[PDB]
């Protein structure tokens, strides 16, 4: 079906009969003619992809496209009605016959997954004004047309356009006669005097000899829910101009791109992904140094004091006395070492003690001191020697999720979940995710059901049951007020063992400076 998908890429490396793979990141793979495969992804990781590809090129041909093929993204309901108002056809084709009817659908989710329209378009500088297409059969649009769209498909012209765009000879022949703005101006000035002296035409007809045919591709993405359009590098500017000329189209940026990706359920690669190598490395680095510069920039008595915050965890221990993790970044190394220590405590005894060159660790303070000592040793040298958190969503189904004294050798799997706030509260980035304890389990259930005042309104001005310290099972990476539902959406990553531990989906959320615990429920995300 040659449909475009958005999956997770890996770095494979086999030297002699051995196979060790590492989490790489995202990628977009597309097949054409069962041989021509295009792979598009982030440049920073594209370098490594190209390297690991070129190292194995004995029976394969590689072609880089960094300054000869470009793609631009359209989002919204009326995104295809403007792309159609800009694009025109040089010769009759069924691709355009389907695209014309698609432009009137106005609903992207109603269309099926397989939707790829490619043809040869005219240069957008040729058109004077973005004239809209014929709108007369707008009322007679039923589901039979969408049913027939899956059957009727001109594969031959699609493959021809794809081979023209892939081959570097036709791609260069497209630049044969690229008329200048002065050329088009003179042609439009001389179209004033034509043979039919009854109709005023502000456009210029197409020529099969002295005119360039431009190959274009349109694909729809299911995960991101957007329409990507691919066009040569030097041809993107004339299309981009006429696209922006539509007075309902604004330019979206990387910040707003991350916002749109976070809004639905999705994730951003460098900022959100905590388990890949380069993404997590650069996340930890840039965010930690930036927050530390903003922190040390301010003087004493002007910044929030993470060191001195009382009543954060019941039965406070004299180890940190402030924040349990990192004051600036959402650190998963501390979470991993702490959970490893707690697991060792459960493996040595049924109960755990709180207060009392490897030491016989008998309390939580001993593990907190080990974490602090690891951080004090890391103060000077690089971090992330092996990893902190992998992601194993399929491995548990494949064989099993399986549970010397290192405390930092084996990592802990996490699942991508979305926890939503069901009550008063506002989340933020680098937030802490705790699990509801067993003793005060009915109080949170009654609060989630309802506790009102004699006046009638809700009642949350009560004493909260501050939980213990060994209950942190996750960190929120994308904390922003959800505007699509009216509440606080939290995008975090919780442990699978702790997910199977609880019999309920209730989870507490806390900030990095705030000492309040909000309640919510999480839902799994398959990304």
């Amino acid at each position: 079906g040659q449909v475009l998908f958005q999956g997770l890429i890996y770095s494979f490396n086999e030297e002699n009969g051995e196979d060790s793979t590492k989490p790489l990141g995202p990628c977009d793979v597309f097949w054409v003619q069962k041989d021509t495969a295009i792979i598009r992804l982030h440049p920073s990781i594209y370098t490594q992809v190209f390297n690991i590809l070129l190292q194995h090129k004995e029976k394969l041909t590689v072609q880089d496209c960094r300054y000869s093929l470009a793609s631009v993204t359209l989002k919204g309901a009326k995104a295809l009605e403007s792309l159609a108002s800009c694009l025109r056809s040089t010769e009759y084709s069924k691709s355009f016959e389907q695209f014309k009817m698609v432009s009137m659908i106005t609903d992207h989710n109603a269309l099926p997954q397989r939707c790829t329209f490619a043809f040869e378009a005219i240069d957008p500088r040729h058109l004077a004004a973005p004239k809209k297409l014929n709108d007369s059969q707008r009322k007679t649009v039923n589901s039979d047309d969408i049913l027939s769209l899956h059957e009727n498909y001109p594969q031959d012209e699609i493959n021809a356009v794809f081979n023209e765009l892939c081959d570097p000879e036709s791609r260069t022949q497209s630049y044969n006669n690229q008329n200048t703005l002065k050329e088009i101006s003179a042609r439009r000035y001389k179209l004033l005097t034509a043979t039919p002296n009854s109709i005023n035409k502000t456009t210029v007809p197409f020529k099969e000899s002295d005119d360039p045919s431009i190959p274009l591709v349109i694909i729809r993405r299911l995960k991101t829910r957007d329409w990507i359009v691919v066009l040569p590098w030097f041809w993107l500017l004339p299309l981009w101009h006429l696209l922006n000329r539509i007075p309902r189209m604004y330019h979206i940026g990387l910040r707003q791109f991350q916002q749109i990706q976070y809004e639905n359920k999705q994730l951003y690669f460098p900022d959100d992904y905590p388990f890949t190598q380069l993404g997590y490395i650069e996340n930890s680095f840039y965010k930690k140094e930036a927050s530390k510069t903003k922190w040390d920039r301010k003087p004493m008595g002007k910044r929030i004091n993470f060191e001195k915050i009382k009543d954060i965890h019941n039965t406070k221990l004299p180890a940190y006395s402030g924040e349990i993790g990192d004051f600036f970044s959402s650190d998963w190394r501390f979470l991993q070492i702490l959970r490893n220590g707690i697991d060792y405590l459960q493996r040595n005894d049924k109960t755990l003690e709180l207060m009392d060159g490897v030491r016989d660790i008998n309390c939580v303070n001993d593990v907190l001191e080990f974490c602090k000592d690891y951080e004090a040793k890391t103060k000077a040298m690089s971090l992330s020697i092996e990893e902190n958190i992998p992601v194993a969503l399929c491995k548990n189904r494949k064989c099993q999720f399986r549970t010397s004294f290192s405390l930092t050798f084996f990592p802990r799997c996490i699942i991508a979940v979305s926890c939503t706030l069901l009550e008063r509260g506002h989340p933020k980035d680098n937030a802490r995710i705790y699990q509801v304890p067993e003793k005060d389990l009915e109080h949170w259930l009654q609060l989630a059901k309802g506790v009102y005042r004699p006046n009638g309104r809700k009642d949350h001005d009560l004493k909260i049951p501050l939980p213990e310290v060994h209950d942190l099972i996750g960190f929120i990476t994308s904390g922003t007020y959800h505007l699509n539902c009216g509440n606080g959406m939290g995008i975090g990553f919780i442990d699978h063992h702790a997910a199977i531990r609880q019999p309920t989906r209730y989870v507490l959320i806390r900030n990095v400076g705030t000492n309040t615990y909000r309640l919510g429920e999480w839902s799994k995300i398959s990304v």
């Binding site: 659908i105 106005t106 609903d107 109603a110 099926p112 707008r138 039923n142 589901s143 969408i146 049913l147």
Partner: protein, 121 residues
Amino acid sequence: KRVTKHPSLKTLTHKQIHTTIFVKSTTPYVSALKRINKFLDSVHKQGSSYVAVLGMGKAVEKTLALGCHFQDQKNKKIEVYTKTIEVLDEVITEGSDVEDDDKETQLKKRAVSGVELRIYV
């Protein structure tokens, strides 16, 4: 059997979408009242006369409740129409171990009855 349901085809030009509220199954009552009041106040600036209230399936009951509210509360003429809505569903047909989401998708039609509720000013 795994089967997914997509929304129904909506072809609204520029103003049918503005003066129309699509009542979901999870849409609250008071928020619907607020949006209906806003639409009623913005109609004559959009240049229409009535406000469309479309709901199908589970939300039909509370859509009729919204209609009956403004029926006598504000004394505004309401019109109830019964229409049919066709929805396309992607089903998997039997024909190693692949992903459940990445299987053979076949489109199937399903007709459901719905209520359109117009409110005058």
